[PDB]
Design a protein around this ligand. Structure first.
Ligand SMILES: COc1ccc(-n2nc(C(=O)O)c(=O)n(Cc3cccc(C(F)(F)F)c3)c2=O)cc1OC
Ligand SMILES: CC(=O)N[C@@H]1[C@@H](O)[C@H](O)[C@@H](CO)O[C@H]1O
Ligand SMILES: *[C@@H]1O[C@H](CO)[C@@H](O)[C@H](O)[C@H]1NC(C)=O
Ligand SMILES: *[C@@H]1O[C@H](CO)[C@@H](O)[C@H](O)[C@H]1NC(C)=O
Ligand SMILES: [Zn+2]
Length: 215
């Protein structure tokens, strides 16, 4: 998160930290959010060979009792996910067990909020601590330069006049507007000039519900 503030610890109890393992490279990192005790929503580009989820985290380097490190048994990438366009950048992860409900872990032009452990700047490393920022929801013409952006599929997020933005490592995390999850962090520019592209959750709700009811 660029230009945000450190969260009050455990104030966003649905937030999930994803370590993503591939066969030909070192660990990758994503965000995500708990919508059932055994399901986490995130972005499809965060898929890999295997994934471990950490709930209850704030400072991701300092292990504490709030932590629940949970195995992912199955990844459900949208069947129409496109790795070039990032169309339909949404994925469900089924946890091996139901997480415990605690204080620190629970299920989940207007201003919206997004949080994550991602980079704090173009050359800055990933944040140790959960960070959050307020961003403006923009009319779709603001994201026109992203040639494969589509207003029905995706939100345009982040005033281009400001620095504030989600950035690398913040992928998969929720965009909350007035307390409700509206988007998922998908992609933006390398230089981190906003706006950024987020998955529009509303369009995918029937698909989300199909996956939950079969699993
Ligand atoms: C479909 O089209 C695209 C797909 C991917 C990327 N793209 N490219 C990057 C690069 O290194 O070139 C890069 O770093 N990021 C990460 C990134 C940059 C800014 C904001 C975010 C966040 F969290 F979404 F908000 C992520 C990225 O998504 C860019 C595209 O279109 C130019
Ligand atoms: C094991 C570890 O990373 N601990 C570091 C410590 O070395 C550093 O001096 C300080 C910075 O806030 O606290 C933290
Ligand atoms: C997070 O914890 C690590 C290890 O104690 C420390 O290096 C880092 O400074 C901490 N960051 C905070 C509390 O912002
Ligand atoms: C992904 O998108 C490109 C560009 O529109 C399309 O031509 C390509 O065949 C797609 N790939 C899949 C497997 O969806
Ligand atoms: Zn704590």
């Amino acid at each position: 998160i660029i230009g945000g503030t450190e969260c009050k610890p455990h104030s966003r109890p649905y937030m999930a930290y994803l370590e993503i393992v591939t066969s030909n490279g070192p660990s990758k990192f994503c965000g995500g959010f708990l919508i059932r005790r055994n399901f986490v929503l995130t972005a499809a580009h965060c898929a890999g060979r295997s994934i471990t989820v950490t709930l209850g985290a704030h400072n991701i380097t300092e292990e504490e009792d709030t932590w629940q490190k949970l195995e992912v048994i199955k990844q459900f990438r949208h069947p129409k996910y496109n790795t070039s366009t990032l169309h339909h950048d949404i994925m469900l992860l089924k946890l091996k067990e139901k997480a415990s409900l605690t204080l620190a872990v629970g299920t989940l032009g207007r201003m919206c909020r997004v949080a994550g452990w991602g980079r704090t700047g173009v050359l800055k490393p990933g944040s140790d601590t959960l960070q959050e920022v307020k961003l403006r929801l923009m009319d779709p013409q603001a994201c026109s330069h992203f040639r494969d952006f589509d207003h029905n599929l995706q939100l345009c997020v982040g005033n281009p006049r400001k620095t504030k933005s989600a950035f690398k490592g913040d992928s998969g995390g929720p965009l909350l507007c007035a307390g409700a999850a509206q988007g998922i962090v998908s992609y933006g520019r390398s230089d981190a000039k906003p706006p950024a592209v987020f998955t529009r959750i509303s369009h995918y709700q029937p698909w989300i519900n199909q996956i939950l009811q079969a699993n």
